[PDB]
Design a protein around this ligand. Sequence first.
Ligand SMILES: *[C@@H]1O[C@H](CO)[C@@H](O[C@@H]2O[C@H](CO)[C@@H](O[C@@H]3O[C@H](CO)[C@@H](O)[C@H](O)[C@@H]3O)[C@H](O)[C@H]2NC(C)=O)[C@H](O)[C@H]1NC(C)=O
Ligand SMILES: *[C@@H]1O[C@H](CO)[C@@H](O[C@@H]2O[C@H](CO)[C@@H](O[C@@H]3O[C@H](CO)[C@@H](O)[C@H](O)[C@@H]3O)[C@H](O)[C@H]2NC(C)=O)[C@H](O)[C@H]1NC(C)=O
Ligand SMILES: *[C@@H]1O[C@H](CO)[C@@H](O[C@@H]2O[C@H](CO)[C@@H](O[C@@H]3O[C@H](CO)[C@@H](O)[C@H](O)[C@@H]3O)[C@H](O)[C@H]2NC(C)=O)[C@H](O)[C@H]1NC(C)=O
Ligand SMILES: *[C@@H]1O[C@H](CO)[C@@H](O[C@@H]2O[C@H](CO)[C@@H](O[C@H]3O[C@H](CO)[C@@H](O)[C@H](O)[C@@H]3O)[C@H](O)[C@H]2NC(C)=O)[C@H](O)[C@H]1NC(C)=O
Ligand SMILES: *[C@@H]1O[C@H](CO)[C@@H](O[C@@H]2O[C@H](CO)[C@@H](O[C@H]3O[C@H](CO)[C@@H](O)[C@H](O)[C@@H]3O)[C@H](O)[C@H]2NC(C)=O)[C@H](O)[C@H]1NC(C)=O
Ligand SMILES: *[C@@H]1O[C@H](CO[C@H]2O[C@@H](C)[C@@H](O)[C@@H](O)[C@@H]2O)[C@@H](O[C@@H]2O[C@H](CO)[C@@H](O)[C@H](O)[C@H]2NC(C)=O)[C@H](O)[C@H]1NC(C)=O
Ligand SMILES: *[C@@H]1O[C@H](CO)[C@@H](O[C@@H]2O[C@H](CO)[C@@H](O)[C@H](O)[C@H]2NC(C)=O)[C@H](O)[C@H]1NC(C)=O
Ligand SMILES: *[C@@H]1O[C@H](CO)[C@@H](O)[C@H](O)[C@H]1NC(C)=O
Ligand SMILES: *[C@@H]1O[C@H](CO)[C@@H](O)[C@H](O)[C@H]1NC(C)=O
Ligand SMILES: *[C@@H]1O[C@H](CO)[C@@H](O)[C@H](O)[C@H]1NC(C)=O
Ligand SMILES: *[C@@H]1O[C@H](CO)[C@@H](O)[C@H](O)[C@H]1NC(C)=O
Ligand SMILES: *[C@@H]1O[C@H](CO)[C@@H](O)[C@H](O)[C@H]1NC(C)=O
Lengths: 423, 285, 196, 49, 224
Amino acid sequence: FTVEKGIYQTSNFRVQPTESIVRFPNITNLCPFGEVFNATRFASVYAWNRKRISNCVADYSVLYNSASFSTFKCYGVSPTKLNDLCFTNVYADSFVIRGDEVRQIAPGQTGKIADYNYKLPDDFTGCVIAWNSNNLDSKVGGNYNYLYRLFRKSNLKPFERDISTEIYQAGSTPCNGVEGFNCYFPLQSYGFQPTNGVGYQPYRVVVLSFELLHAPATVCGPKKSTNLVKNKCVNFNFNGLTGTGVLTESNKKFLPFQQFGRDIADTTDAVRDPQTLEILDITPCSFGGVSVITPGTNTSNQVAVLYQGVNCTEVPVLTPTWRVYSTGSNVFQTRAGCLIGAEHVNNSYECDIPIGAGICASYQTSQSIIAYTMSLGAENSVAYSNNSIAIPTNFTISVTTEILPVSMTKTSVDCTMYICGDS
Amino acid sequence: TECSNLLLQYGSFCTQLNRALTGIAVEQDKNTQEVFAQVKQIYKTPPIKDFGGFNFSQILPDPSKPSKRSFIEDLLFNKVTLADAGFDIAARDLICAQKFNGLTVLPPLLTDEMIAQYTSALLAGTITSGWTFGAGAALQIPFAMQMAYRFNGIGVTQNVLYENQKLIANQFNSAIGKIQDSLSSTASALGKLQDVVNQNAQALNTLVKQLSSNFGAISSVLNDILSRLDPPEAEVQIDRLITGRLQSLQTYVTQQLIRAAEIRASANLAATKMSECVLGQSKRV
Amino acid sequence: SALGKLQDVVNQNAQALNTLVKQLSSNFGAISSVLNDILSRLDPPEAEVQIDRLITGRLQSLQTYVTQQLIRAAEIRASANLAATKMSECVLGQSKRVDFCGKGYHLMSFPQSAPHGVVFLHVTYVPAQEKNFTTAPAICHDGKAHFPREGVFVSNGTHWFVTQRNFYEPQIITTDNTFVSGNCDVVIGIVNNTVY
Amino acid sequence: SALGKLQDVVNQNAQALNTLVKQLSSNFGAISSVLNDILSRLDPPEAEV
Amino acid sequence: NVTWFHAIKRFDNPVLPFNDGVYFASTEKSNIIRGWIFGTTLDSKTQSLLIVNNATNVVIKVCEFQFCNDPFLGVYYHKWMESEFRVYSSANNCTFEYVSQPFLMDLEGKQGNFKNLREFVFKNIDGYFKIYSKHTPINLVRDLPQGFSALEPLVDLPIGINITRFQTLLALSSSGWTAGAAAYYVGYLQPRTFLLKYNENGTITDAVDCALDPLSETKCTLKS
Ligand SMILES: *[C@@H]1O[C@H](CO)[C@@H](O[C@@H]2O[C@H](CO)[C@@H](O[C@@H]3O[C@H](CO)[C@@H](O)[C@H](O)[C@@H]3O)[C@H](O)[C@H]2NC(C)=O)[C@H](O)[C@H]1NC(C)=O
Ligand SMILES: *[C@@H]1O[C@H](CO)[C@@H](O[C@@H]2O[C@H](CO)[C@@H](O[C@@H]3O[C@H](CO)[C@@H](O)[C@H](O)[C@@H]3O)[C@H](O)[C@H]2NC(C)=O)[C@H](O)[C@H]1NC(C)=O
Ligand SMILES: *[C@@H]1O[C@H](CO)[C@@H](O[C@@H]2O[C@H](CO)[C@@H](O[C@@H]3O[C@H](CO)[C@@H](O)[C@H](O)[C@@H]3O)[C@H](O)[C@H]2NC(C)=O)[C@H](O)[C@H]1NC(C)=O
Ligand SMILES: *[C@@H]1O[C@H](CO)[C@@H](O[C@@H]2O[C@H](CO)[C@@H](O[C@H]3O[C@H](CO)[C@@H](O)[C@H](O)[C@@H]3O)[C@H](O)[C@H]2NC(C)=O)[C@H](O)[C@H]1NC(C)=O
Ligand SMILES: *[C@@H]1O[C@H](CO)[C@@H](O[C@@H]2O[C@H](CO)[C@@H](O[C@H]3O[C@H](CO)[C@@H](O)[C@H](O)[C@@H]3O)[C@H](O)[C@H]2NC(C)=O)[C@H](O)[C@H]1NC(C)=O
Ligand SMILES: *[C@@H]1O[C@H](CO[C@H]2O[C@@H](C)[C@@H](O)[C@@H](O)[C@@H]2O)[C@@H](O[C@@H]2O[C@H](CO)[C@@H](O)[C@H](O)[C@H]2NC(C)=O)[C@H](O)[C@H]1NC(C)=O
Ligand SMILES: *[C@@H]1O[C@H](CO)[C@@H](O[C@@H]2O[C@H](CO)[C@@H](O)[C@H](O)[C@H]2NC(C)=O)[C@H](O)[C@H]1NC(C)=O
Ligand SMILES: *[C@@H]1O[C@H](CO)[C@@H](O)[C@H](O)[C@H]1NC(C)=O
Ligand SMILES: *[C@@H]1O[C@H](CO)[C@@H](O)[C@H](O)[C@H]1NC(C)=O
Ligand SMILES: *[C@@H]1O[C@H](CO)[C@@H](O)[C@H](O)[C@H]1NC(C)=O
Ligand SMILES: *[C@@H]1O[C@H](CO)[C@@H](O)[C@H](O)[C@H]1NC(C)=O
Ligand SMILES: *[C@@H]1O[C@H](CO)[C@@H](O)[C@H](O)[C@H]1NC(C)=O
């Protein structure tokens, strides 16, 4: 409740963004979701088809809001966030599998399905969508149109498709064509029938494996792009690259396929506007520490504020929560930042409260806080001559005190007690 | 804000880190004050440079320059070159790569001009007053007579200086000239000062480069994690970055504390040299 | 604020301990910072996940505290080594090192014990009231150059004397005060005067 | 014990080095402290944890 | 070690491996080897890439297209004459086909000081095929010259297929046949760290192969 004379560091100040900016490529055609989802027939798990999606706007909200899907799981993104996210390319893969195999579809799994026909990567980023299609693609006699690969010489790599019907031979004895000893047809048909119990029923699965934030985005959300404003601290969003800073035209040279230019700390410090092919400079808005200069509280409650590192023109143009000193009339721009609430004077005195760069603050008489350039000492010209000497005719015995720390408190800490109190 | 609220669960780690760095920054101003502010009067050499034949022009201030630095002092300030960017001659924002991520450089309390004035006052006091200004009021004495006292201090009778005053002055003037030539030609003379600049710049760059690490998260970009994941699963990714970045900052601060201790020991030695070698004649070998 | 140095050591150690104790109130991502509450609420399997978060944070808090204490201890050791050196060279003897035992010419020092420290009372000699005199490096007497054995030649305007060079005590220039070396033709600034 | 000051430096460095090596036998919450054992028993997804 | 081939009866145009990329600089006229094949079957079974990079434009034709044993036009031009038509056997099926700007390499008849170092880096990875290119005006028609020049990216295509082999496409009876005076190199790319010197303009002016020799590795370690 009482603070001694000095200068104290207080919560940093920062220029908040004035407004948001959204910049997406302008496209209106919806993606062919109806083609992949409502296709007449789906391919087999081993013959899983991969349909490319590009140059379109995808409204993922409609897909997620449909209750017909028994499973809608996203592994690198949230389904809600998809609507606001701009992607490079999307691979929509469709196949029909047994219900029990839905778990194996998830990344990092294993099994005959996961090791012979369809394998996801460990770092998969995307959404998997499935829904029972027993009534759609099942028959009482057994809709054997859907097969899977049970025999394979070696495990397939992730996102690998095998169509060859070569007869595998686990127990050596390589045959071909007709089956026989140790050699069987690799593909086996499912018994997809309506009478089959849950899990054995066929399931239609569509999985999206889009890549994220690594290249000029092509497909992205049904959110209208806003106008472009520069030279202002604003929030920008270039194809899902959200951030905060002050835009500015740049003399940059991006190669035709370049969109983002990153910083040493892996931060984008220059962007290319998707709508107009121009390069903009990116710079997080101005910031700095806030130091309060005060004499003793019991000496006075008047204070001065230093916005260190930012020149004063910005401050009239935030975080500190008290924009009442902005009235000014005594704002002084020092090399250490803007100083508010202190009267600048040309008289130089001994430093009292250090501010930096040779500037010090003092509380003197009517009373006010002043800022000045510190004085190093009294000027003195020694009366040197080549035949003149000064000799002391008298003396003073001086006794001066010197204080030196010698020891500090001996402290012991019981590790277990501090971390695990009698537990 | 999402990351900031999570960071509150770690207590006062951030307050300790800021407090530790503030202690270092304040100590740097103390180090300079101890070494250079050893004289409470700003002595100035007389206009007539009759010092018994001794040339001090290359170490006395040059009024022509905007900064009253001696010829040799100018050479020293040119040999040492910054590494990242202006710390300085900055007329605007710091303009550094570190600035982007909450890292700022504070100007020293004493400007280079002020430190040069202190050096000038110490130098003017020595050549016009010998060692007296360090023990009390500056008592003028002819420089040749002062050198006679110095010779007595090393066991050589003062008649040796007077009978060889012209020779001794020439040797001193020649010796000073060689210092000027050495600094103008060689580059690694100020390796000690350059090492300090390089070490601090290198550590600061490592701290900034550490923001590009995933630390096991899906991405090293905080905004990307927030834009792609919902709060529940975003926190798991955010927490991985907090742990790594918090560990990175602690590593930086601990190294700075250890480096600051080394610099403080060096500054204490420089302050002792200023008192015992400049303000007096030392018999320590 | 005379003993600010000693107070700073006390405050820093107290502040460090308070920060260490305050770290026991941090979740570090756990459901609660109270270890008993976690145990009372959760079963072993789920409790371990929450307890492990506290262990990581508490352990990190202890390591930060100890590392700071080691760095502070080294600073105190350097101060103690300096104090021991001052005790030997300022109290157990008379030091010719400038400013090592106070400002001025050191005479003697007295130690005084203080909490977690030591105070030295440095007694120094400080010349007080100087006067201008005209001076010469040597005296030319009889074709010979005379130099002071221990002192400096001074003139009050009309007469020349020898004085010890720390206190004005003028004395007649005699053959006991000075010594001869060479003739008067080499010394720059030599002045004629009689050596008694 | 004349050279205790020199012996202490040797002991402190050796002790710290032994502590560093002994620290390789700690689980730190893993199933085992042996890295090869973890790899030999778990698939990459679980082994990473 | 970069293999050297003779672009000719003596058709040195085999199904070479495409191990994680290939380097295909060459100096010649008429573009000889204009097209290339990248896939895993290369006989219409799979959508084997059929990129032609002809005098007009780089017509990406990733179709399940048939490549006969010798899929060449056999044009004994300047010996302009044609023998048969097997460059494009037949399109049994297809997957995707893209046509770029109607550019034109310097394949046009010109030897002089051969400025035809049409350095191409064909790389296929992560379901993409990249055609980094550069037109360096070199002066020597003999073996590959000495110098430094970065290759700008040219084409990027989210194909998504798996590729394990590749083959080059030649557009050019056996009695007294004058073998064509054209050759191409096939370098191979392997995972290697390079220290790229970006000048003040964002153009790579120098590079260091961090595994070439101890001095290079020292430069890489010091990041200088
Ligand atoms: C510089 O110092 C010398 C010596 O102290 C001064 O010369 C001295 O002047 C005083 C007079 O002020 C003389 O004292 C007198 O003594 C004689 C006896 O010898 C006596 O008869 C007089 O009545 C008077 O009391 C002193 O003798 C004389 N010494 C010499 C060698 O001449 C001189 O005054 C000083 N000069 C200045 C500018 O201060
Ligand atoms: C100290 O010693 C003498 C004290 O008088 C001074 O140096 C000398 O001044 C005298 C004049 O009285 C000169 O002696 C004369 O020489 C000239 C030239 O030959 C002659 O014409 C005169 O009749 C007289 O004999 C002498 O030249 C001069 N220099 C020397 C070396 O004796 C002076 O006051 C003081 N000089 C020094 C170096 O301390
Ligand atoms: C990279 O970009 C910089 C800056 O654009 C290039 O700077 C070059 O600076 C010289 C200065 O003499 C220019 O030569 C001059 O050209 C101007 C404009 O025609 C003319 O008015 C001057 O009298 C002088 O002749 C040069 O044109 C300019 N280059 C470019 C492309 O603008 C620099 O050359 C580029 N490369 C490197 C390695 O820096
Ligand atoms: C050397 O410095 C000494 C000061 O530390 C000084 O001692 C002082 O001398 C004066 C003159 O007598 C004393 O004053 C007493 O006398 C005057 C005049 O009556 C008054 O102003 C004082 O109040 C007091 O009555 C000082 O008290 C005295 N101080 C001490 C500690 O003794 C010497 O005079 C100086 N010596 C020379 C030769 O200059
Ligand atoms: C003390 O040392 C000084 C440098 O060691 C020396 O300064 C030098 O003085 C000479 C003669 O004035 C200069 O010589 C030449 O420089 C001027 C520059 O315009 C030329 O135009 C003339 O031709 C010329 O004679 C040196 O340049 C000068 N150097 C500097 C840095 O000032 C002093 O002369 C010495 N002082 C004494 C009393 O001897
Ligand atoms: C000692 O001398 C200087 C200069 O003046 C004196 O110089 C002697 C050589 C002698 O001639 C003597 O008669 C003369 O008075 C003094 O410095 C001076 O102090 C006065 C104070 O008003 C100023 O007016 C002068 O500008 C100033 N000159 C310089 C170069 O500094 C000095 O005060 C004197 N010191 C003592 C202890 O007497
Ligand atoms: C010391 O300085 C004095 C004067 O400041 C010198 O005395 C002479 O002064 C006049 C002034 O017009 C000059 O013409 C003379 O040339 C000076 N002497 C010489 C040798 O130049 C005095 O010489 C200087 N040296 C000493 C030892 O006192
Ligand atoms: C697929 O079919 C059902 C109705 O048969 C419909 O609700 C759904 O919207 C369709 N999905 C798309 C993308 O058209
Ligand atoms: C966005 O609009 C501009 C002109 O209105 C157009 O040039 C640009 O091609 C549009 N973006 C895309 C991806 O077509
Ligand atoms: C500060 O001023 C108040 C008067 O209101 C006084 O009570 C108090 O003693 C003073 N404290 C100090 C440290 O001077
Ligand atoms: C300093 O002096 C000038 C005139 O020389 C005056 O105008 C100015 O107001 C003074 N500085 C301040 C901060 O008042
Ligand atoms: C402060 O920044 C403003 C731009 O906002 C600029 O106009 C002004 O010149 C700057 N002043 C100083 C002293 O740098």
